[model samples]
Target: CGETCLLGTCYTTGCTCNKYRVCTKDGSVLN
Candidate 1:
């Protein structure tokens, strides 16, 4: 199991908000 970050986007898999406020496979908020 893992996280998928996406900015105003979606996927068949799970996602979350990344550092860039974009999308990623992990929930890591960057500065």
Candidate 2:
């Protein structure tokens, strides 16, 4: 899965600890 972490103090990707995992795209996304 493509990785993305928020700057609002909470973050997660594959589920464990999550608040918001936002995403933006233009070309290649490696985060």
Candidate 3:
């Protein structure tokens, strides 16, 4: 999920992930 919705891939706000988070906004590990 990317922060900018225009970038095209956000699931839903507050969606949690135990592993393999795909947020490309700030480029954090999210692990």
Candidate 4:
């Protein structure tokens, strides 16, 4: 999760993916 007060870049910025091809937190495929 991210800070509720964050805006702009923070809002645009999404969770980062690992090189393994799945998201680290939710295990979704990297886009």
User: lDDT per residue, candidate 1, 1-31, as tens digits?
Assistant: 1333443554535554555545454554231
- List, residue by residue over 1-31, the lDDT tens digit for candidate 2: 2344545432444322233353423323443
Collision pairs in model 1: 4-15, 4-16, 5-16, 5-23, 5-24, 6-23, 19-30
TM-score of 3: 0.18
User: How many clashes in each structure?
Assistant: 7, 1, 0, 0
Off by more than 4 A, model 1: 1-13, 26-31
What's the TM-score of every candidate structure? 0.29, 0.14, 0.18, 0.22
Q: Please give the RMSD of candidate 3 to the true structure.
A: 8.5
Error of 4 at 21 (Å): 1.1
Q: Give me the displacement of residue 16 in model 3, in angstroms.
A: 1.5
Better of 1 and 2 by TM-score: 1
lDDT of 1 at 13: 57
| Model with the higher TM-score, candidate 3 or 4 | 4
Q: For model 4, how does the per-residue alpha-carbon lDDT over 1-31 read when each residue is reduced to its tens digit? A: 2223223222324644445332333444432
Please give the TM-score that candidate 4 achieves against the real structure.
Answer: 0.22
Stretch of 10 with least lDDT, candidate 1:
1-10
